[PDB]
From Swiss-Prot, chain A:
Signal peptide (UniProt feature, chain positions): none
Natural source organism: Saccharomyces cerevisiae (strain ATCC 204508 / S288c) (Baker's yeast)
Keyword Transcription (UniProt): yes
Full-sequence range covered: 17 to 76 of 78
Top-rank taxon, per record: Eukaryota
Name of the molecule in the record: High temperature lethal protein 1
Primary localisation category: nucleus
Swiss-Prot record, chain B:
Family classification: Belongs to the RSC9 family.
Functional note: Component of the chromatin structure-remodeling complex (RSC), which is involved in transcription regulation and nucleosome positioning. RSC is responsible for the transfer of a histone octamer from a nucleosome core particle to naked DNA. The reaction requires ATP and involves an activated RSC-nucleosome intermediate. Remodeling reaction also involves DNA translocation, DNA twist and conformational change.
Other remarks on this protein: Present with 2610 molecules/cell in log phase SD medium.
Protein name listed in UniProt: Chromatin structure-remodeling complex subunit RSC9
Quaternary structure annotation from Swiss-Prot or TrEMBL: Component of the two forms of the RSC complex composed of at least either RSC1 or RSC2, and ARP7, ARP9, LDB7, NPL6, RSC3, RSC30, RSC4, RSC58, RSC6, RSC8, RSC9, SFH1, STH1, HTL1 and probably RTT102. The complexes interact with histone and histone variant components of centromeric chromatin.
Species per Swiss-Prot/TrEMBL record: Saccharomyces cerevisiae (strain ATCC 204508 / S288c) (Baker's yeast)
Cellular location(s): Nucleus
UniProtKB/Swiss-Prot annotation, chain C:
GO biological process: chromatin remodeling; nucleosome disassembly; positive regulation of transcription elongation by RNA polymerase II
Organism: Saccharomyces cerevisiae (strain ATCC 204508 / S288c) (Baker's yeast)
One Gene Ontology cellular component: chromatin
Protein name, per record: Chromatin structure-remodeling complex protein RSC6
Further remark: Present with 2470 molecules/cell in log phase SD medium.
Paired cysteines (S-S): none
Swiss-Prot record, chain D:
Coiled coil: 43-75
Name of the protein this chain belongs to: Chromatin structure-remodeling complex protein RSC8
Subcellular location: Nucleus
Note: Present with 3380 molecules/cell in log phase SD medium.
Species: Saccharomyces cerevisiae (strain ATCC 204508 / S288c)
Disulphides: none
Length: 60, 148, 310, 93, 45
C-alpha cells in the first residue's frame, strides 16, 4: 500500500522482464490468461446479456 | 461548470464555478441570454442557488421541536408541562453563501422583460424562506430585494 | 462535509484511447453507457434538493371524540394531558396572535409571518429610505403593534432581536384544567361535568417509515459495485498497455530493444544500492576495509571531519 | 464467432437501453413542467391569502377598538384558530 | 408534491370565497347597528 523507490523500480523491472521473456516464448501464462478471460464468466455474461435483451424485447 | 456547482462536498470547486459564472455574465446582458438558453443550466441554477444561500451555516432546526414531546413534570407547586426548547439563529454566512449572494445581486441588475430577470422572479419565494431563516442574508441580499 | 475525504483505494480510472477502432468494436457502447450513467447521476442529485414551498397555514390535509366525567360519590385542581402534543404545533401568545392572523401553529410559521409582516409594511432601513427622510442599515423600525408585541419602547431593533423575541412569544398547547373542589353533602352527583375533546390526531397516528437500515446497505452496495468496475477498468488498462508495448516493438524493434537493455541495466543498478546496510555489513569490518576496490564509503571521512558532523 | 455474437447482442442491448432511458427522461421533463405550473399558481394564491390575513387581522383590531369606543358589548372573534377559517361578531359580558 | 400543491390551492380558493361572504354579512350587520369603517379584503380592489 506504500510506494518507495525500491518498490517502483522493482515493479517496472518486473513488467519489462515479463514482457521480454514472453517475446522469447520462455513463459507459460495459461492460468493468468484464463483467469482474466474466464470462459465460464464469458458464458455467464453472455446468458445475462441474452436475458436482458429478451426482457427489453418483450416489454413492448 | 454548472454541474460542478451542483456538488456539495467541495467548497473550493463551488467557489471556482461561481467565480467563473460571475466573470461570465458580468459584461452585459447577451451573455445572460446565452447562459439561460440552455435548459439544463437553467434548471441546475434554479435548483442550486437558493440552497447555496444556506450552505453550511447551521440554520435553526425545527426538528428538535417535532421530536420533543410534551408531558407533565413529575413530582406544593402547581403542575407545569415543560418548557419548549430554545431556537438559535445563525449570525454569519459562509464563503459559498457570500459568493452566491454577490452572484444573485449581479444577476438581478439586468433589464426586465429579458431572461435573468425572470429567473429572479421564479426564484424569489425560496429566497424568502431563506431570508426568514437568516438575517445576515437579508442584509446581504439588498440589491436583489430592490430589483424585484 | 466541505472536502472530498481522501481515501486509500483507486476511485476511478481512465479508459485507454490508443486501441485500434477496427479491432475493438465495443468501446463506443461503453462510452455511451458511461455518458448515460453520468446523466442519471446529474438528474438524481439535482432532483434530490429541497425546493418545496410551504406557506404558513393550518387545518392541513371527524366524529371521533371523547367525554370525561367527574363526580363525587358517598355512601382541588385537575389537570389532564393527551400525549399527542409535540413542539410541531404550539400556542401563540395573545399579543402575537394579533400581528399574525392565527393563534396556533408551528414556530417556523410564526417566524415566516413575522418576516412577511416586516416586509409588507416597509420597515427595513434601506439606502432609499434613508435618502428620502441615526439608525443603522438593515434595522427594523417598530410600529405601535410591534412594540406592544416585543414590549420595547425602542424604535430601531435589529432582526436577531426580533426573532429571539419570537422565540420568547411561544408556549406549548395548554392542558385540560378543571376546578372541581369538593362535595360532601349530596349522596352522589354525576353532574354534567362533561368535556368533549378531539382525539382525532391520536387515533389516526401518521407515522414515518423505518430508515437507517437500508441507507447503509445501499451505500455499501454502491461502493462495492463501483470498486468492482474500477478494478475491471484497471485490468483493461493493463492489457492495453501490454498490447501497445508489443505493437511499438513490432514497429521499431531496434530502438525498443536498446531501451529495454539500458533500462534493465539501470534498474538493476538501482536495486543494488542498499545491500550493505543491514547490520551485518555494518557490524563487521568488511565494508570499512581499504581492500575494497570501490571506496565510496571511507573516502567521505575527510569531508565529514571538516564539517564537524562525523 | 463467440465474441462476434456477443458484439451483436451488445449493440442491440445498448440501443434499446438508450431509447428506453430517453423516453423516461422525456416523461420526467413533462411532469416537471406541470409541477412548476402548479407551484406557481399555488404561490400566487398563498401570497394573496397571507396579505389578506394580515390586513384583516389589523382591521379586526381597529374595529374592536372602535366598538369599545362607542359602548357596544360585542366583539369580533375568529370562528377558529385562524382568520381564513372565518370571523364573526359575538356578544360577551 | 404536485397533488399536494393542487389540493392546497383549491382549499385556499374555497376559504377565500367563504370569507368574502362572511365579510359581506358582517359589514351589513355593522351598518345595521353602527360603524365608521368596513372590513376590506385586499384582493378585492
Amino acid at each position: 500500500n506504500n510506494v518507495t523507490l525500491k518498490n517502483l523500480t522493482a515493479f517496472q523491472l518486473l513488467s519489462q522482464r515479463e514482457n521480454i521473456c514472453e517475446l522469447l516464448n520462455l513463459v507459460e501464462s495459461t492460468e493468468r490468461h484464463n483467469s482474466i478471460i474466464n470462459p465460464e464468466r464469458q458464458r455467464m455474461s453472455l446468458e445475462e446479456m441474452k436475458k436482458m435483451l429478451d426482457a427489453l424485447k418483450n416489454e413492448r | 461548470i454548472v454541474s460542478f456547482l451542483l456538488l456539495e462536498c467541495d467548497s473550493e470547486l463551488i467557489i471556482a464555478s461561481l467565480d467563473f459564472l460571475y466573470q461570465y455574465i458580468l459584461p452585459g446582458s447577451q451573455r445572460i441570454t446565452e447562459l439561460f438558453k440552455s435548459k439544463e443550466c437553467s434548471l441546475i441554477l434554479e435548483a442550486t442557488l437558493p440552497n447555496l444561500l444556506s450552505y453550511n451555516i447551521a440554520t435553526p432546526d425545527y426538528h428538535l421541536l417535532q421530536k420533543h414531546k410534551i408531558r407533565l413534570i413529575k413530582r406544593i407547586t402547581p403542575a407545569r408541562q415543560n418548557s419548549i426548547p430554545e431556537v438559535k439563529f445563525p449570525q454569519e454566512l459562509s464563503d459559498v453563501s457570500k459568493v452566491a449572494c454577490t452572484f444573485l445581486c449581479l444577476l438581478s441588475n439586468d433589464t426586465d422583460d429579458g431572461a435573468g430577470s425572470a429567473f429572479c422572479q421564479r426564484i424569489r419565494p425560496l429566497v424568502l424562506h431563506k431570508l426568514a431563516d437568516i438575517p445576515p442574508l437579508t442584509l446581504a441580499l439588498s440589491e436583489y430585494m430592490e430589483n424585484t | 462535509q466541505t472536502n472530498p475525504v481522501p481515501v486509500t483505494y483507486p476511485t476511478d480510472a481512465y479508459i485507454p484511447t490508443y486501441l485500434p477502432d477496427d479491432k475493438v468494436s465495443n468501446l463506443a457502447d461503453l462510452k455511451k453507457l458511461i455518458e448515460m450513467d453520468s446523466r442519471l447521476d446529474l438528474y438524481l442529485t439535482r432532483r434530490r434538493l429541497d425546493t418545496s414551498i410551504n406557506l404558513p397555514t393550518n387545518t392541513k390535509t371527524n366524529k371521533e371524540m371523547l367525554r370525561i366525567y367527574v363526580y363525587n360519590t358517598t355512601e382541588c385542581s385537575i389537570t389532564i394531558q393527551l400525549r399527542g402534543v409535540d413542539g410541531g404545533k404550539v400556542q401563540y401568545s395573545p399579543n402575537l396572535a394579533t400581528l399574525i392572523g392565527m393563534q396556533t401553529g408551528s414556530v417556523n410559521d410564526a417566524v415566516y409571518s413575522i418576516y412577511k409582516y416586516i416586509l409588507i409594511n416597509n420597515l427595513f432601513v434601506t439606502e432609499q429610505t434613508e435618502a428620502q427622510d441615526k439608525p443603522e442599515l438593515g434595522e427594523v423600525k417598530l410600529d405601535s403593534l410591534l412594540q406592544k408585541v416585543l414590549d420595547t419602547n425602542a424604535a430601531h431593533l435589529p432582526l436577531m432581536n426580533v426573532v429571539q423575541t419570537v422565540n420568547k412569544l411561544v408556549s406549548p398547547l395548554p392542558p385540560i384544567i378543571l376546578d372541581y373542589t369538593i362535595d360532601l353533602s349530596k349522596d352522589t352527583t354525576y353532574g354534567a361535568t362533561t368535556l368533549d375533546v378531539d382525539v382525532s390526531h391520536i387515533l389516526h397516528q401518521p407515522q414515518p417509515q423505518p430508515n437507517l437500515q437500508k441507507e447503509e446497505e445501499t451505500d455499501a452496495e454502491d461502493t462495492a459495485k463501483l470498486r468492482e468496475i474500477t478494478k475491471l477498468a484497471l485490468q483493461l488498462n493493463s492489457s492495453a498497455q501490454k498490447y501497445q508495448f508489443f505493437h511499438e516493438l513490432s514497429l521499431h524493434p531496434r530502438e525498443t530493444l536498446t531501451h529495454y537493455l539500458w533500462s534493465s541495466k539501470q534498474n538493476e543498478l538501482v536495486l543494488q544500492g542498499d545491500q550493505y546496510f543491514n547490520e551485518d555489513a555494518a557490524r563487521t569490518s568488511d565494508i570499512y576495509s581499504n581492500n575494497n576496490n570501490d571506496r565510496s564509503l571511507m573516502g567521505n571521512i575527510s569531508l565529514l571531519y571538516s564539517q564537524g558532523r562525523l | 464467432k463467440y465474441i462476434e455474437e456477443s458484439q451483436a447482442i451488445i449493440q442491440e442491448l445498448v440501443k434499446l437501453t438508450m431509447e428506453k432511458l430517453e423516453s423516461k427522461f422525456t416523461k420526467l421533463c413533462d411532469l416537471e413542467t406541470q409541477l412548476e405550473m402548479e407551484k406557481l399558481k399555488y404561490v400566487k394564491e398563498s401570497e394573496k391569502m397571507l396579505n389578506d390575513r394580515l390586513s384583516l387581522s389589523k382591521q379586526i383590531l381597529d374595529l374592536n377598538k372602535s366598538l369599545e369606543e362607542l359602548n357596544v358589548s360585542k366583539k369580533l372573534v375568529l370562528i377558529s384558530e385562524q382568520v381564513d377559517s372565518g370571523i364573526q361578531l359575538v356578544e360577551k359580558d
